[PDB]
Write a protein that binds this ligand. Sequence first.
Ligand code: HEM
Ligand code: HEM
Ligand code: W69
Ligand code: W69
Ligand code: H4B
Ligand code: H4B
Ligand code: ZN
Lengths: 407, 411
Amino acid sequence: RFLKVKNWETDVVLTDTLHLKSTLETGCTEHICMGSIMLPTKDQLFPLAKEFLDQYYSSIKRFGSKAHMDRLEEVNKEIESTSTYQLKDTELIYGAKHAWRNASRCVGRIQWSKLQVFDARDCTTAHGMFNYICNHVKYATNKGNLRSAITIFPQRTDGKHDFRVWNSQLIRYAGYKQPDGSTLGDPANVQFTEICIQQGWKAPRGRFDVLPLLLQANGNDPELFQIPPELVLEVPIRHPKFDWFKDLGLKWYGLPAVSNMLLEIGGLEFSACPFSGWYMGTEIGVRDYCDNSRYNILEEVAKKMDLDMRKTSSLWKDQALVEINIAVLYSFQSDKVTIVDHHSATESFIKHMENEYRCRGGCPADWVWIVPPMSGSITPVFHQEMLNYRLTPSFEYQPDPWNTHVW
Amino acid sequence: RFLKVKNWETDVVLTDTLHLKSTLETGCTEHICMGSIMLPVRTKDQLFPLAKEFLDQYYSSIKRFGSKAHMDRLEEVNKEIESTSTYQLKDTELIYGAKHAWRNASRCVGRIQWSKLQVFDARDCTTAHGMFNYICNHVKYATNKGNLRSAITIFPQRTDGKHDFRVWNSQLIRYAGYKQPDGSTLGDPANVQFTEICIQQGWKAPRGRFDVLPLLLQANGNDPELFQIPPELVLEVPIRHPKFDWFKDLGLKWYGLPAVSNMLLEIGGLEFSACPFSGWYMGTEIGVRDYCDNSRYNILEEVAKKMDLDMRKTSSLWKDQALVEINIAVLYSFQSDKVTIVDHHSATESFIKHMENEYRCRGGCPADWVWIVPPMSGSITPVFHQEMLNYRLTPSFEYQPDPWNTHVWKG
Ligand code: HEM
Ligand code: HEM
Ligand SMILES: Cc1cc(N)nc(CCc2cc(F)cc(CCCN(C)C)c2)c1
Ligand SMILES: Cc1cc(N)nc(CCc2cc(F)cc(CCCN(C)C)c2)c1
Ligand SMILES: C[C@H](O)[C@H](O)[C@H]1CNc2nc(N)[nH]c(=O)c2N1
Ligand SMILES: C[C@H](O)[C@H](O)[C@H]1CNc2nc(N)[nH]c(=O)c2N1
Ligand SMILES: [Zn+2]
């Protein structure tokens, strides 16, 4: 019931007590581990509220206070009357920060307490949503000196008045299927791109077309908006040794901003809660550029390097992979856009774990997602045992809106 | 019940039914995933159902389920159990069992080869000297002058837990580690404790960076005895790089034969506590883990210096760059010397095909993603994108405690 995790590089052992507070389920059982699977009423509401308010009031050293009891009573009375309840600003900010703190798949959580929370609960329309999002984008970008932020739209009511950002991320490149049979731009975004066109977007059929926002307010029909180009900071990718690299025509955007997840706080559900931090280099250079079902540039790069691509054992793929990731980091750094390499980031995370174990009694972590997609065992997280469990508040996946939407 | 796994690169979906035959536990619960945790004398009572489960599987596999031969065998085993408190496997059952333990090993990427395993029956062995002879023969057969052949040698099963056969070496061939008074380490830091035991047991250490350890062999629960594997049987490979000529001067080599000797083979409830097995190396085992772990030979710095990489900031990815060159060198050396080796691209691609074949023919393939994905370049291998289900089937290979912690010394 008290669990130990070992680091096999350092022999440091940590003891986890925090998992006992866990409430949501894992997908795993005593007979089967699903650790590598990517996607495994009033009566319901009050214990969730209580659960949350207890941890909130504990966090401010006011557990068992009159203010605690009063709030507990006030929320209880409000649920009986209104079926739901509204969070105080203080609770909202606490909840969002802790959702991030509890994100077991996030290597960047050392930063969790430094998060700018934009309260957009007064938003009523898609145009309003657009305004709020432009402001988020500009604030977070900060001329390349990135700052973590979340913008939080009104909470779910009856599920028929959901606010949704249809984009999976605030900033992404379009995807187009060619009559050539091939794929132009980002293959991951082909279907979403069609929904944009079908809803009226005039696509420029390029390779790096920043997508438009598709915004849904109050359960109404979604609408299209274009982020001001001057608010989308992009970085042309060059290599600090290969002059030819620039001719590949690669660029990426500076702001990673996830917009499709569900924020759950104290039983309440925030269906539209876009959040952003800054990139770890491998996200772009390993996954975005080298994934086979993505931009898949390994072959082109290798040829420019004149590698023997006859036999896998020459490790030409591995060599190109490194150089591509070198270029990414170099290009962001040169243009003063915040970025972190996988060594720095995993090193920070180990320090964060040790802090969390020391100050909270644990840190839920998903090894499968925490270990970088390149050079795994030369990062300290590879050698770190991690316990994965679900704490609340949380960010959760939710179904894409086009499957759910009564049009 | 049915379970789906998805490959996120291809959208290929597979359906697992095999997990219904799972017995042993995972360590996980509905509240916690222990998927990245490294680690987790039997009564007649529990033994016969374990025997029966096994014998049912065996007779199904040879398409004689329910046959008179099947029924007589169950009969014969049941009686032998209630009479002698244990039982003996037939040669055929032993071979079937060993192959399936490998086939079931969810942490092994090399399982496409599982049906080609040479099984050496060493159940007639009685002394440590006899163990030595068997192990030399295994090493010679498996090495095959560089054309490596998978093999396993199976020593007598556990009886009361007081007469265990054990190979004290974690692997048959491995380099010594020596801790210096200044705190530095000569050789393989992983093997310091065991090296110290060997020395205490009377081994004369040459004290170099690549000293092959002697074998420490325990028969019938007696105190272990030291033996030196004939050097001419230990195939080694000097590591050089195809373009960097200074790489040879790093003075690196490795042995060709990876042979795990510290695990326990369970077949039909019987426990084989000494069952050394061998295959051939995937390059990253040596080039990534052995050479480049901070806790092992740790050569990243020296290599990076000789390549003259910018090492002042990690963002140059000097470590990643050096790591690739080292791994090219390992593969290059082995291939040049005609010693069997496989790269992590070939091996993972072969595993995916094996896994899919297993799903179609067997209804599943238990696999541990955390171990299957190679320790470099993870997502440019197809296993990274493959959802996997991890569960435990028997027969199986299991960890067991280190013998120096449990052994009762006779003196
Ligand atoms: C500030 C620097 C940050 C870094 C370096 C970072 C890094 C990462 C990385 C590399 C991943 C894996 C994503 C993937 O492979 O697709 C991830 C996942 C995740 N991050 Fe962080 N992140 C940062 C900020 C944030 C913030 C501000 C939040 C929320 C407020 C957050 C919440 C999450 C969540 C919920 C996941 C898992 C999402 C999923 O399961 O798909 N991150 N992060
Ligand atoms: C023939 C070529 C083979 C290849 C390329 C191969 C590859 C591998 C690799 C890379 C690992 C991970 C090792 C580590 O990271 O320490 C592994 C683990 C394992 N292999 Fe295979 N292997 C082969 C043959 C065999 C054979 C012949 C057996 C048994 C009959 C076997 C059983 C296992 C088991 C039980 C593990 C898990 C070890 C543990 O948990 O410590 N393998 N294999
Ligand atoms: C907040 C944040 C910071 C950071 N460094 N990275 C992220 C993820 C950004 C991202 C950006 C993006 F465009 C796509 C994805 C993942 C796509 C869906 N997966 C599940 C296949 C993620 C988010
Ligand atoms: C049979 C076989 C084939 C193959 N390609 N590889 C192996 C593993 C070889 C090996 C050889 C070795 F010396 C050490 C290890 C791992 C030690 C335990 N870890 C947790 C530190 C493994 C075994
Ligand atoms: C199947 C497997 O779970 C899938 O490929 C995962 C593996 N680990 C990952 N880790 C991160 N950080 N991001 C990912 O998209 C994935 N994909
Ligand atoms: C903590 C973690 O489970 C540990 O470092 C594992 C990770 N995956 C591995 N995978 C392989 N093949 N071999 C290993 O030793 C490990 N070590
Ligand atoms: Zn699990």
